[PDB]
């Protein structure tokens, strides 16, 4: 889709640290909760991410749920150029 | 259904003309560079963007629209 890499980074970055994204199925929202971009940029970016593997999608009541996968982990590792064994949603926080 | 009504003359998209980009950086005498196409004074345009020269017109293209400078 058409969008500046500037907004691509906010998605690609936030997907790496938090490991999971949610998004209501309503384009024209103009600002995602928790992200700095238009809602539309999110949904179609993850859709692009999903269709080359890298992430699964669930819908269930008008809200996409996106699950970053293992094969995805290395891709945006490249795209964020962070080194091998940086992080994911894969941290047991302290003692919980 | 009722396919294909269409009185003629279909519409075209934009083209984005080729315009092999600026040598509009005239150097004078090896290599005093005189920098044609006066730049823009808005802090979002860090003076690297220039002003388009139409009639009654100096337009900042980097501002997708904003700020008509008049000279």
């Amino acid at each position: 889709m058409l969008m500046p890499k500037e907004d691509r980074n906010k998605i690609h970055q936030y997907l790496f640290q938090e490991g999971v994204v949610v998004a209501k199925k309503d384009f024209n929202q103009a600002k995602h909760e928790e992200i700095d971009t238009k809602n539309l940029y999110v949904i179609k970016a993850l859709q692009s991410l999903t269709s080359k593997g890298y992430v699964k999608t669930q819908f269930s009541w008008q809200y996409y749920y996106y699950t970053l996968t293992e094969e995805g982990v290395e891709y945006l590792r490249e795209y964020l150029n962070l080194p091998e064994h940086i992080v994911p949603g894969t941290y047991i926080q302290e003692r919980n | 259904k009722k396919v294909y009504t269409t009185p003629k003359k279909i519409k075209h998209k934009h083209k984005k003309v080729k315009l092999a980009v600026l040598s509009y950086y005239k150097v004078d005498a090896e290599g005093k560079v005189t920098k044609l196409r006066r730049e823009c004074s808005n802090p979002t345009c860090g003076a690297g963007v220039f002003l388009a020269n139409h009639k009654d017109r100096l337009y900042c293209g980097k501002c997708h629209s904003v700020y008509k400078v008049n000279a």
């Binding site: 064994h85 940086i86 992080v87 894969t90 941290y91 | 860090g46």
Partner: peptide
């Protein structure tokens, strides 16, 4: 296991010398 905690890796790799800034003539 699989350390360095990306949420804070931008905060440890937050050392400078990764930019440049100069403008404003005429």
């Amino acid at each position: 296991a699989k350390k360095v905690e990306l949420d804070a890796e931008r905060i440890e790799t937050a050392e400078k010398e990764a930019y440049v800034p100069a403008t404003k003539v005429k």
